[PDB]
Amino acid sequence: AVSMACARPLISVYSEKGETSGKNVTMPAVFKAPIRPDIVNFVHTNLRKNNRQPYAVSKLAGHQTSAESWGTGRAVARIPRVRGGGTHRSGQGAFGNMCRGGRMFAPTKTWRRWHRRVNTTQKRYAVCSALAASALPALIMSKGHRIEEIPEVPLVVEDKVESYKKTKEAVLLLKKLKAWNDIKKVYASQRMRAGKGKMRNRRRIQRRGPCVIYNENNGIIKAFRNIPGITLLNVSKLNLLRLAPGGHVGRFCIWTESAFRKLDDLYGTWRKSAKLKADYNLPMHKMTNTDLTRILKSQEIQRALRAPNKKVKRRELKKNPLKNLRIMMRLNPYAKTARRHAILQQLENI
Amino acid sequence: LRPLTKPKIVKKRTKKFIRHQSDRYVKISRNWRKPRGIDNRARRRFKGQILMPNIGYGSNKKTKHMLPTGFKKFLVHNIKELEVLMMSNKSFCAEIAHNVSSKNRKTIVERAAQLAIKVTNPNARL
Amino acid sequence: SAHLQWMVIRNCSSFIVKRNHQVFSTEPNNLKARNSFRYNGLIHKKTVGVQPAADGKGVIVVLKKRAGQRKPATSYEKISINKNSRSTLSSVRHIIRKNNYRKDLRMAALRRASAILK
Amino acid sequence: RAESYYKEYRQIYRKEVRLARIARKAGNFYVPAEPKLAFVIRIRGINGVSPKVRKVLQLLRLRQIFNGTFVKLNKASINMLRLAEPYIAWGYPNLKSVRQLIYKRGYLKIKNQRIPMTDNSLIEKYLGKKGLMCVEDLIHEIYTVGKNFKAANNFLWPFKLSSPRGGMNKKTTHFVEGGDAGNREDQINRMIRRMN
Amino acid sequence: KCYHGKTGRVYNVTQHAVGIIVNKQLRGQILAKRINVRVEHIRHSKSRDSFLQRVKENERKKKEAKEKGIWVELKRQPAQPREAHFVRTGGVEPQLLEPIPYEF
Amino acid sequence: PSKLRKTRKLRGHVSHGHGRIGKHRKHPGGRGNAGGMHHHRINFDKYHPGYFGKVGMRHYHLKKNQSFCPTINLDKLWTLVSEQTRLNHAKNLEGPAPIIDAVHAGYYKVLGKGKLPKQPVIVKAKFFSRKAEEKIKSVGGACVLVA
Amino acid sequence: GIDIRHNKDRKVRRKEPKSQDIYLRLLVKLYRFLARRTNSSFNRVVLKRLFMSRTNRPPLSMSRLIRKMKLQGRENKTAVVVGCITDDVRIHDIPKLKVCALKITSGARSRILKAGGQIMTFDQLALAAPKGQNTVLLSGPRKAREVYRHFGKAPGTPHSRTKPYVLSKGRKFERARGRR
RNA sequence: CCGGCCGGACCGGGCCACUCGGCGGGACGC
RNA sequence: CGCCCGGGGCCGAGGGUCCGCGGCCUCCUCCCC
RNA sequence: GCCGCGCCGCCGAGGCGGGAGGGCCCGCGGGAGCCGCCAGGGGUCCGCGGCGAUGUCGGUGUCCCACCCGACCCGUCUUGAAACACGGACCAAGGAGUCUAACGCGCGCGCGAGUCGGAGGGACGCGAAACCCUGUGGCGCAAUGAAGGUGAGGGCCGGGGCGCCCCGGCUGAGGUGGGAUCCCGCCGCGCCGGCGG
RNA sequence: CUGAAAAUGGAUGGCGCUGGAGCGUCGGGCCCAUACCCGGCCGUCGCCGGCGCUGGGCUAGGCCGCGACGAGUAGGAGGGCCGCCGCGGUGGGCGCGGAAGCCCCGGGCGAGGGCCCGGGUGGAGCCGCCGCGGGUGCAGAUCUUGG
Numbered sequence A: 001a002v003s004m005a006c007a008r009p010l011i012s013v014y015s016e017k018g019e020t021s022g023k024n025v026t027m028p029a030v031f032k033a034p035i036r037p038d039i040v041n042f043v044h045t046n047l048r049k050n051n052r053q054p055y056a057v058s059k060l061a062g063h064q065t066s067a068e069s070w071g072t073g074r075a076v077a078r079i080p081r082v083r084g085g086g087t088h089r090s091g092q093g094a095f096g097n098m099c100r101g102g103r104m105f106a107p108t109k110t111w112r113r114w115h116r117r118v119n120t121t122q123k124r125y126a127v128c129s130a131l132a133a134s135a136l137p138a139l140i141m142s143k144g145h146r147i148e149e150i151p152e153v154p155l156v157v158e159d160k161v162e163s164y165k166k167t168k169e170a171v172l173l174l175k176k177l178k179a180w181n182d183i184k185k186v187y188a189s190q191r192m193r194a195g196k197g198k199m200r201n202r203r204r205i206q207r208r209g210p211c212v213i214y215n216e217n218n219g220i221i222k223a224f225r226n227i228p229g230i231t232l233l234n235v236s237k238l239n240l241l242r243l244a245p246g247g248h249v250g251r252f253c254i255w256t257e258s259a260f261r262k263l264d265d266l267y268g269t270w271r272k273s274a275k276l277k278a279d280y281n282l283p284m285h286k287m288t289n290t291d292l293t294r295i296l297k298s299q300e301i302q303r304a305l306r307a308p309n310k311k312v313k314r315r316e317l318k319k320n321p322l323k324n325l326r327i328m329m330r331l332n333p334y335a336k337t338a339r340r341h342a343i344l345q346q347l348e349n350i
Numbered sequence B: 001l002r003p004l005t006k007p008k009i010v011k012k013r014t015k016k017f018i019r020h021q022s023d024r025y026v027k028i029s030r031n032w033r034k035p036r037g038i039d040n041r042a043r044r045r046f047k048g049q050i051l052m053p054n055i056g057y058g059s060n061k062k063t064k065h066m067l068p069t070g071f072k073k074f075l076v077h078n079i080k081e082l083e084v085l086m087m088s089n090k091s092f093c094a095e096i097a098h099n100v101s102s103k104n105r106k107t108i109v110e111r112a113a114q115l116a117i118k119v120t121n122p123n124a125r126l
Numbered sequence C: 001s002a003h004l005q006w007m008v009i010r011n012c013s014s015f016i017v018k019r020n021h022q023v024f025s026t027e028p029n030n031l032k033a034r035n036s037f038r039y040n041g042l043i044h045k046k047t048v049g050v051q052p053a054a055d056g057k058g059v060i061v062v063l064k065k066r067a068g069q070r071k072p073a074t075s076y077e078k079i080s081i082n083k084n085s086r087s088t089l090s091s092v093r094h095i096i097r098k099n100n101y102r103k104d105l106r107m108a109a110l111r112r113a114s115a116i117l118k
Numbered sequence D: 001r002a003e004s005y006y007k008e009y010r011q012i013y014r015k016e017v018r019l020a021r022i023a024r025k026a027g028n029f030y031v032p033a034e035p036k037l038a039f040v041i042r043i044r045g046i047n048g049v050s051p052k053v054r055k056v057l058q059l060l061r062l063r064q065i066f067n068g069t070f071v072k073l074n075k076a077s078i079n080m081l082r083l084a085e086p087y088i089a090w091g092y093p094n095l096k097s098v099r100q101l102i103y104k105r106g107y108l109k110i111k112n113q114r115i116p117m118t119d120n121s122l123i124e125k126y127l128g129k130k131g132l133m134c135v136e137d138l139i140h141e142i143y144t145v146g147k148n149f150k151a152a153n154n155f156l157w158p159f160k161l162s163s164p165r166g167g168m169n170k171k172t173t174h175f176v177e178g179g180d181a182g183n184r185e186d187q188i189n190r191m192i193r194r195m196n
Numbered sequence E: 001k002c003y004h005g006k007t008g009r010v011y012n013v014t015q016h017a018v019g020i021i022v023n024k025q026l027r028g029q030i031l032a033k034r035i036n037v038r039v040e041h042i043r044h045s046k047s048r049d050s051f052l053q054r055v056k057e058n059e060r061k062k063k064e065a066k067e068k069g070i071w072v073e074l075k076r077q078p079a080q081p082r083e084a085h086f087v088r089t090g091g092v093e094p095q096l097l098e099p100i101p102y103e104f
Numbered sequence F: 001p002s003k004l005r006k007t008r009k010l011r012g013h014v015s016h017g018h019g020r021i022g023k024h025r026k027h028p029g030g031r032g033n034a035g036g037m038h039h040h041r042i043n044f045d046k047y048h049p050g051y052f053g054k055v056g057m058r059h060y061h062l063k064k065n066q067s068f069c070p071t072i073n074l075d076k077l078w079t080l081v082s083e084q085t086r087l088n089h090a091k092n093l094e095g096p097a098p099i100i101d102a103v104h105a106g107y108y109k110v111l112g113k114g115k116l117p118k119q120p121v122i123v124k125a126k127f128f129s130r131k132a133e134e135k136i137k138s139v140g141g142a143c144v145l146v147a
Numbered sequence G: 001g002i003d004i005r006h007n008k009d010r011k012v013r014r015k016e017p018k019s020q021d022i023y024l025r026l027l028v029k030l031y032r033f034l035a036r037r038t039n040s041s042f043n044r045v046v047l048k049r050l051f052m053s054r055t056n057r058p059p060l061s062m063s064r065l066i067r068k069m070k071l072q073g074r075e076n077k078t079a080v081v082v083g084c085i086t087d088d089v090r091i092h093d094i095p096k097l098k099v100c101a102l103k104i105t106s107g108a109r110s111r112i113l114k115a116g117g118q119i120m121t122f123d124q125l126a127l128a129a130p131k132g133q134n135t136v137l138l139s140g141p142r143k144a145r146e147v148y149r150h151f152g153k154a155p156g157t158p159h160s161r162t163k164p165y166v167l168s169k170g171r172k173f174e175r176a177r178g179r180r
Numbered sequence H: 001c002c003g004g005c006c007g008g009a010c011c012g013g014g015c016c017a018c019u020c021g022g023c024g025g026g027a028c029g030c
Numbered sequence I: 001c002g003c004c005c006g007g008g009g010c011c012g013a014g015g016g017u018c019c020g021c022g023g024c025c026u027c028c029u030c031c032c033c
Numbered sequence J: 001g002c003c004g005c006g007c008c009g010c011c012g013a014g015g016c017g018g019g020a021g022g023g024c025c026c027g028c029g030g031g032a033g034c035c036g037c038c039a040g041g042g043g044u045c046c047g048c049g050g051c052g053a054u055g056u057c058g059g060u061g062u063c064c065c066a067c068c069c070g071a072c073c074c075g076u077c078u079u080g081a082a083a084c085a086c087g088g089a090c091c092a093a094g095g096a097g098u099c100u101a102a103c104g105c106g107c108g109c110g111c112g113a114g115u116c117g118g119a120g121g122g123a124c125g126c127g128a129a130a131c132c133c134u135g136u137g138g139c140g141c142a143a144u145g146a147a148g149g150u151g152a153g154g155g156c157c158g159g160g161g162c163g164c165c166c167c168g169g170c171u172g173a174g175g176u177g178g179g180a181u182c183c184c185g186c187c188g189c190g191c192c193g194g195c196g197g
Numbered sequence K: 001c002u003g004a005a006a007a008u009g010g011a012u013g014g015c016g017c018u019g020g021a022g023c024g025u026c027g028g029g030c031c032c033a034u035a036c037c038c039g040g041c042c043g044u045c046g047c048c049g050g051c052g053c054u055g056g057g058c059u060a061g062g063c064c065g066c067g068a069c070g071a072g073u074a075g076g077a078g079g080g081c082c083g084c085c086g087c088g089g090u091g092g093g094c095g096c097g098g099a100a101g102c103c104c105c106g107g108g109c110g111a112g113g114g115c116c117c118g119g120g121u122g123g124a125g126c127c128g129c130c131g132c133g134g135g136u137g138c139a140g141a142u143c144u145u146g147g
C-alpha cells in the first residue's frame, strides 16, 4: 500500500581497529523493507531445492530374473517364484515389493521434479526482507550470533579490508570489531553429524558465523576463506540461502563501505527505482506503523473505546429459593411478610 | 524442597490401556491400537472387554503432568538449561538427562542446590 | 517495532527451549526466563536484566539505554548492587518505579534479585 | 405487585367457590371455565419416534425424556397434544406446581443459554418492556395466562425434571386405562411433586 | 393427473387458456411448474377470495376504530377454552342413563 | 511434501479410504474416455455437450499467420503512446493531432468497445470497425488505413 | 438422550486469517481490539474481511473506485478497501481520492498521489476513523472471476448459459451433438 | 530551549560525460 | 417451600456485592449482677 | 333469551362514604451514619487424637496369586460370523496409495491489465547453486458464426420531430425491489438509545 | 381333563413350587440401565463472550468467563510437544567420568500415539527446538526371507 519514506539513521563506517573512521553512510531503504518470514521461508525452501542431485533406483532392480508364478494348487502364495534348480534361490518370490530381493514399490524415477522455479519478484522480495532483518539487533541475537559487543548492528567497515591478502589480517579485524566471539562459537559447534551423513561426505558439522559482504574482490575472498563460519557474498550477487540459513532471517553481516553504497542502487528507494536492475523497486507496506501498543494507546482511539469490562463474573450455585430463606426474599420481597403473617396466624389459631 | 502447592491429584484411571489381544500374541505389543475390525468386540465396546482410551479420561488440567511430589518434570542437559528454572522453582523440578556423564552431573546437582531447584535424580551415577 | 519483531521471534529463536510442554527462553535480559511478549529481553527498547555479579556476592541490574538501540557495545548500562538483601531490593525498586522504566517488570525483578542473593 | 398477586391468587379461588355454592343453592350447576394452562411432560425417549410426533415434541421444546413446558390451551394446541399423547403426560397445574417449577427448576434463556434464575435483574432486563420485573410477575404471567404469556413462557427454559420418585404405573398406556400417558386433569400435580 | 386438485397463481393469460405456477414436490425440491391449461379445468380459489375480504374488513375496522379512538382486534384466535357458565336444570332432574343388556 | 499427504492419516485403516464393499479395483468403468456413448453418456451429454459429431468445414493446411489480426479497443487506444503525448495535445485541441500507429504497437484492427477522450487523434491501422470509426470522427479525429 | 442434530453445530467460518503474514496478523490484532471495544459495526465488518481469502478479497479497479466515489454525498469520505486496488488504464481523470487499502499497485499509487489524493493504511484508518466515520467501505467484484462462469446447472441442460470445461476452443471442440 | 543529521507525490533559485521518454524544452536525480 | 423442627448418606467445584436483620445515632424502667 | 326495577341469598367475590368504641396491623414516618449479625456472589476450623530404624509407614497401576462380577477368535466378505465360512502353529526383519504429465476447485504468495524466461545469453569446495539480461512465445485483455466475416456506452439537460427518433450541451453504465457499511435530521439521555430520510 | 404318536438324556432357564413359586383381578413396598436429576473432571461446539487500562498477568497462535453438548461402520476433515530416515538452521547441545542399541518383579508422565529417568549390558557416536525431503509406523495378504 504505502512506503516508509521516513527519516533513516546515519550508519557509521568503522576502520580496521574497530573505531569510527569519521565517514558515515545513510541507512539504505532496503533495510526498511517489509520483513516477511513467510516469503523468506518460501523462497528458501524452493531455492535450496535447486542444488540437489537426482537419485533413483536402477531400472533392472528386482526384474532381471525369469520368475513365473506356480499358479494355484501348490499350497503356495501365488507369488512369482524363481525357476527350479539346485540353488536356494529356486522357489522364492522375485518381483513383488514384499519379497526379499524383489522390486521396491514405485521405484524412484530420475525424472522426479527436483527443481522449483520462483518468481524473480519473490526472490528479490525475500532478499529485501533478509537484509532488513539483518539490521535489527533482536533478530541477529535470536539467530544466535554473538554481537553483544559489536560497535553497530549494521557493521560497515572501510573498503581497505577488500584488499586484504592474509588470514591473520582478517582474524585481527574480527578481533577489533568484537565479532571474534561468534567465530569462537563456530569452533564450539564443530562436532560430528548424527546419522548416515557421515558415510556420505557429511561427517563434520558446524554453525554459521558472520557474513562478510563486499563489492570488489581485491583479495578479500582469500583472506576470509580459511576462517570457519565466514561467508563471503558479493553485494551484486546476494544469495538468500546464505543470508537466511535454514529459512530463518537475522544473520550477522559485516558490510563494506563500497558494498553499503551500492546496496541502495541494487534495490532503490521507494522514490527512485533500482539503477542496477531493470524495472524493480522495493516492496510496499500494508502497515506503516507496526507498534501495536502505541496505536492503541493513542487518544484518538481511546476516545472511541468503551469502559474496559475488567469485572469477571462466574457461575453461581443457584441455591433453592424454596429451601433457602435469604434467596427467596431476594427474589420476592413480600415472601418475608407472607411467612411472618402465616406463622403469627398459626399461633393465633392455636 | 516443597512445591508452591500440593493439591490432591485425581487420576480417573491408573491401569494402562492394553491393546486388544496383546496377551495372546507376543507379536502384538501392549501399545494401544484402536481396533478397526468389522466384528470386533472391543471396538463395539461390548460389556466385559478391554476399554478404549478416549477423551474424558483426561486428567485435570490443573494437576496434569504433575509428579507425585507436586512439581512438574523438566529435562535439563547443562547448567544453562538448569538456570532457566531459577524462577518458578516452586512449580518445576529439574531432571538431568541420561546421556550426560557423571563428571557433569555433580556440577548440575551442586548448582541446583544453590538455586533451590529440586532434582528428581540427584544421586544417579556418583 | 516490538510487535513486528515479536512475530518473528515468537516461535523461531535460538533461545527458545521447548520441552515437557513448557517454553523457556535463555536470553540474558529475561526475568522470568519465560518466552512471552512482555518478558522477552531483546524485543523492547526498555529491558531490565538482574544478573549475578562477576564475583560470588551482589547482583547486576542491566538497563537498556534509550539511545543505545542499534549499537550493542554501548546499549546496556550495568548497575552493580552489593548491599544487604533489604537494601538491594529497595535499589532495584527505585530504579524501576522512580524512573518509570518497565513498571510491569518491577516485582518480576525483585523476585529474581531475591533468588540470586540466595 | 407480590402482595397484590398474594391477594389476587386467593380471590380467584374464592370467586369460584361462591359461584359454585350459588348454583348448588338453586339446584343448578356451575361449570367452571376450561383450563387455559397445561404442563406437558415428555415421558418417552427418543428411540423410534414417528416424524410427525417427533416434530410436535420439538415445537413443545420437549426434546428429551422428563422435561416440561407450559402450554396455553387452545384448539391449535390441544390438537398438537393429541398427536403426541403416547409420548406426553400433561394436565392442569395449580399455583403451587407453577411456583415450585419456576423457583426450583426455573431457568432462563437469555441468548439460547440456560441461565439460572438468581436475581430479578435478568427477568426485568428481557421482560421489562412487557411489565414483568420480578419472579412473581413471571409466575403471574404463566399461571394466569396474560397478554405476554408467549414471551414469558418462551423465556423459561424447559424444566429438566427428574425421574418420578415412586415410579410410574405404565408408561406405554393411557392414564385412563391405568397408564401414565395422556391427560390427567388435576392429577398432573401429583406427578409434579414426585418429579420436581 | 398430478396437477388435478392442485392450486397455483396465474402468470400468463391467453385466449381461453391461462398459465399457472403450480408447486410440485418431486423428491426434496418443490418445483414451480409453469403449465398451460384451458379455462374449463380451472376455478377461482375461494380461500383466496375469503382472505381478500378479511383484508378489506381489517382495513375498514382499523380505520373505523381510529375515527372513534377505540381499539378493535383483527388477529384471528383459535377456539379458546369455554368460559365459566351456569347450567339450569329447569326443575326437572337429568335423565338417568345406563348400559342396555345384550340382545343376540 | 509427503508429511501432509492423505496416506499418512490412512495408516491403520484397512480399506485406505476406498470402502469395504466396493474395493479399489483397477478400472471398474473402463480406461480414459471409454463408454462416452454407452455407460458414460449421461455424464458426457450433461457436462460436455456437442462432444460427439462433426461440424463445419475442414481446412487442410491452416497457417495461423494469415489470419493474424490482433484487435485493440478505444478505451485502451491511448495506451500505445506516452501520457505526455495525450496531455500536451489536450491543451491545444484545435492544433495538430497526435498520430497513433496501431500496427506498430502490434494491433491490426481497431474496435470500439470503449469511449474516447475528447480530443482529435490520427489513428493508423489496417482494419477499422464501423463503431470504431464513428467514435474517432465524432471526437474530431480521422482514420488512416495502412497496408 | 436428547433429540438434537449435530450436523451443523460447528459453524464453518474464519475466526482468524489463514495467511501467515506478519503485517496482516498485526492489523488483525489491531482490529480485534477495535471490534471488541468499540461498538461500531464498521470495525466488525473490516475485521471479518481481514480473515477472508484472496478470492474473497477481489481487486478494485480505479474506475469502479471512482464511480462509487463520484456518487452523491461522498465528496469528502474515505474509500476503505480490504484488499487490493488495481489501476484502470481506461480512465484519464482522478478526483483526488482518499483511499485506505491493504495493497495498491504501482500504477494506481502513481495516479492517486499525483492527483492530490491520499493513501492510507488500516493502522492509519484506526487513528483517523476509529469507528469508521466518513468511510465508504467498498468491495471488489467477487463473482467476476472466470471460475464462476463454469458454475451453474450444467452445460448440457436447457436454459443453462454455463461455460463447459474444454481443453481447446474451436470448431471441432464440443459443438456438434447437443448444441444443434 | 536548543543545534546538527536524515528521509520526501516539498517550495523557490544555480550546476551536472547525468539520464529520460512514438515531445532545444519537459520530467527524473547529482 | 404452608408453619416449625429433626435425622441419614453423598461433596466444597471456584480462589485479587446483592438481599435480610440487630445495636447505637432517643430518654428511662425491670430482670440478671 | 335480552333490558329495567324490586325482594332475597351470597367466609369476607366485594368495592366506596360516614358513624360508637374496642385492637390487630404498614417497604408511612429509618439513613451519602458508625458497629456487629448472617438460611446472603461454591469450605472452613483462629478444633483434635493415636503411631516412630531392624520392624514398621506410604507407594509398589505395569511381579505373582486369590475370590465376586463381566467375559465365545481375531482379521475378512456379508442382510446376518464365536461359527460345522475363509486366512492365521510361533518370533524376527521386509511388506502395499507412489512418482511424472495434464485438468479442476479450494488455500497461501508475488506482481497486477497485465503476468511468467519455463529456451538461450551475461556476470562470476559449496557454485549443476545463486545474480543479471532477454517477453520470441504462452496464458489473460473480445467475442461470435460452419464459413465468408463482423465485432461490444450508459445516462442526464435543452430544442425539435409527434408515431416509435434527428440536433446541441453536460457528463461517463441505466431503471425496480432488497442490501453489510457510511451520512444527516429530530427525540430521549458531545457521548448513548428511539424513527425520519 | 380327554382328544395329544418319534426317534442321544433334558428343559416354566434351572432347582423346585400345589394355604401357591399356578391362572385372573388389584394394593402397598422394594430391586437397577451407559436413560432422568444434582455434583466433579475431560473434550468439542456456541457466545455480535471478556482482557492491549499493568500479588499474579497478556507464549494475544495467550489468558479468562458462560451455556449447551459427547454412539459410530463405509467415509470425510482437522489437531499431534506421536514415532522413523535424511537436509538447512539452532542449542558456546551430549559423550570413553561411557553414545546408539538391548534387558529390567526400578521410578514416573500423557486420555492415547508414546516419552523421560534409574539400574544392568554395551563400546563410539548421538539428540532437543524452527523449517525442509520421504523408499516413514504392520498381526494378518494359503505375504516374502530367516529362525
Ligand SMILES: [Mg+2]
Pocket: A063, A064, A065, A066
Ligand atoms: Mg525379467
Ligand SMILES: [Mg+2]
Pocket: A061, A062, A101, A102, A103
Ligand atoms: Mg533389490
Ligand SMILES: [Mg+2]
Pocket: A195
Ligand atoms: Mg540411528
Ligand SMILES: [Mg+2]
Pocket: B013, B014, B015, B016
Ligand atoms: Mg496412566
Ligand SMILES: [Mg+2]
Pocket: B038, B039
Ligand atoms: Mg457387523
Ligand SMILES: [Mg+2]
Pocket: D047, D048
Ligand atoms: Mg421402542
Ligand SMILES: [Mg+2]
Pocket: none
Ligand atoms: Mg411400542
Ligand SMILES: [Mg+2]
Pocket: F013
Ligand atoms: Mg474409520
Ligand SMILES: [Mg+2]
Pocket: F014, F015, F019, F020, F023
Ligand atoms: Mg479390501
Ligand SMILES: [Mg+2]
Pocket: F022, F023, F028
Ligand atoms: Mg466402486
Ligand SMILES: [Mg+2]
Pocket: F024, F025, F026
Ligand atoms: Mg483407480
Ligand SMILES: [Mg+2]
Pocket: J083, J084
Ligand atoms: Mg454352525
Ligand SMILES: [Mg+2]
Pocket: J086
Ligand atoms: Mg474365500
Ligand SMILES: [Mg+2]
Pocket: none
Ligand atoms: Mg489354516
Ligand SMILES: [Mg+2]
Pocket: none
Ligand atoms: Mg516391520
Ligand SMILES: [Mg+2]
Pocket: none
Ligand atoms: Mg438498486
